[PDB]
Structures are given as structure tokens and as C-alpha cells.
Amino acid sequence: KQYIISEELISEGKWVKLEKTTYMDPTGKTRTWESVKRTTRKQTADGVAVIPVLQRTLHYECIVLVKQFRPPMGGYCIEFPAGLIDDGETPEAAALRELEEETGYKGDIAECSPAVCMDPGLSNCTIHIVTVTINGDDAENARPKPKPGDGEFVEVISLPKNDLLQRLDALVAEEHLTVDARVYSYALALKHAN
Template structure:
């Protein structure tokens, strides 16, 4: 039988940020040294990556789109994109994703990114609140947006990507049962 432990921090041990100093800032990211107090009241520092130029009027930095392509007489497919990522010097299978534009909703950003990266047009089913992706490293936040795509509609039978200059993505359509059964094998087959 598992025992329950409390994750509550004692009120006497308040943690808070004292200061944030920018070390370097570029177009998309900045590196900061964050000075904070730990639970024992000791002052510590942390290297933090932050989004540069956060947009006004947006609820998060970006969106990730979990899109399911549905077609008559076909298995449902999860829509993924394969693209080269310089930080890891390799290819990744990813959900279509991107940044939210100024005064744009997460839902409209998701539909825009889906169409740009895959050519598909879909309908939003659900959108999560803003989620932290890697809070030990960054303040980056995203919404996960579920979308269905009617693959029988004419606009979705031969989708054409609308990529930005320099964009190089390949759309990959694994059937949902294969993703559920053995995602690691599917990943290895399609990325290597």
C-alpha cells in the first residue's frame, strides 16, 4: 500500500526570485541568471532560458496540435511532421506546432500552424490551458490543441503545405493503433 506524502511547502520556507540578469539575448531566446531563495532561505542562482519578445495578448508562447485524420474506409491517423532540428543535429517526429501571433487565440494559431505545416484544415475539439514544457530550464509555455480532420473533404484529399522560407517538413501519417501499440518502433522506422 502506497503512502501519501504532502507536496505542500511549509509557510515559513518561502521561495521567490530575487533578481533576473540577462546574460545574452538573441532574436528568439535569451539566457538569464536567476537569483532566488531556496526553501531554507539560502540565496542561489539558476541559469534560465526565456523566450525573447513575448507577444502581447497571448495566453502562451505556442501551440502543439494533436490532429487526427479521419477518412471513410481507412484507419484514423495521427498527423505528425518530420523535420531536422539543429540543436540535436538530427530529425524529430513532432506534432505540428508553432508560436502564437500577437492577439491570436490558441485555437486559431493551431489551425493556422496545422495548415502551414501539413496543408490540412481541421476543426478544434479541445484546447488545454497553458502548460510549462520544461520548467527546470525554460519559461516556455504551450497549449495542446486537439483537432480532427475530415479527410473526405475535397480540401483535405491533396493537402499542400504553406511553409515559411527555409521550412522543410515532411508530413507523416501513422495509424492510431500502430502509435498506441509500438510508438518507439514507428519512430525508429521513420526518423532513421
């Protein structure tokens, strides 16, 4: 019943553009929407985000997250490791790459989502969420070597999976950080399960 008629470019930067989308509403009346798109997509999706489950024997299972300065937020955020998928890279390969770059961990793929939307009222941005396990007892994960790209500046924060939401709430209370909505949604469901 609803569909795009046309798009008008409002403004294009190097990395993002602003568009005005004309669409047909289900009554048959034409309407407009201001939308953002990245300029970088080719690709199943813009990005991957990695849910990294760090498994060490005789330890709690942890979820590995990253803290970075985020210029649109004007502050530090706690997020799943993540980045844009390179042209001709599969989402799986992007996930293992980004996790290795951002955390130094070498992980194994468990599952991969379809493309999911980031903020569909605002943007067309999509990611694959990739669940990866990390065998923390393997020598290659003993002293994990994070390889920042140019201008990345990433702190690794591992939190126990069994208490994730409480630990995130503490960091927020004590550290004036912003938690990512997908991290927080995952932490919620861990508590809400059963």
C-alpha cells in the same frame, strides 16, 4: 514559500536569452538558477502544438505528425505540428493556421489546454496543446496543400492512432529520427489506457 527575487541577463540573442535567476528557497536561503527564455513572447504562451486526429471513414484513425530538420538537435525529429503564436493571435487560430501551413489539412478545434510548460528546469517555454479533428473525407482535405513559411521544410507522416507507439518505435529503429517527448508521452498513454 518560494519566489523569484531577481533576474540577471547573461546573454541575449535575436531569438533566445540566457538568464541567471535568483530565488528564495523554502528554508529562507537564497539560490541561483541558469534559465533560458525566448525573446518572442508578448500572449497566453510561446507556442501551440496540435494533436491532429485524421478521420476517414473505413480507415484507421491516424495522428498526423511532421518530420523536420531541427538545428539544435543536429538531426531530424518527428513532432506534433506546431509553431509560435503571432502577436494578437488566439491559440485556437494559431493551431489551425500552423496545421494548415505544416500539413495542408483543414481541421476543427476539439479542445484546448491551458498553457503547459515545455522543459521547466531549463526554460520558461510554454504551449497550448490543441486537439483538432480532420475530416479526411471532405474535399478540402482530399489533396492537402502544405504552405511552408520561409525556411520551413516539413514532411507529413500519418500514423494509425491504435498502433502509434509501435509505429514510432519502428521509425526510430529504421530511420534514425528523434521522436518528440510529448508525441511519445501521448503514444504511451494510448497503450497504457484501461
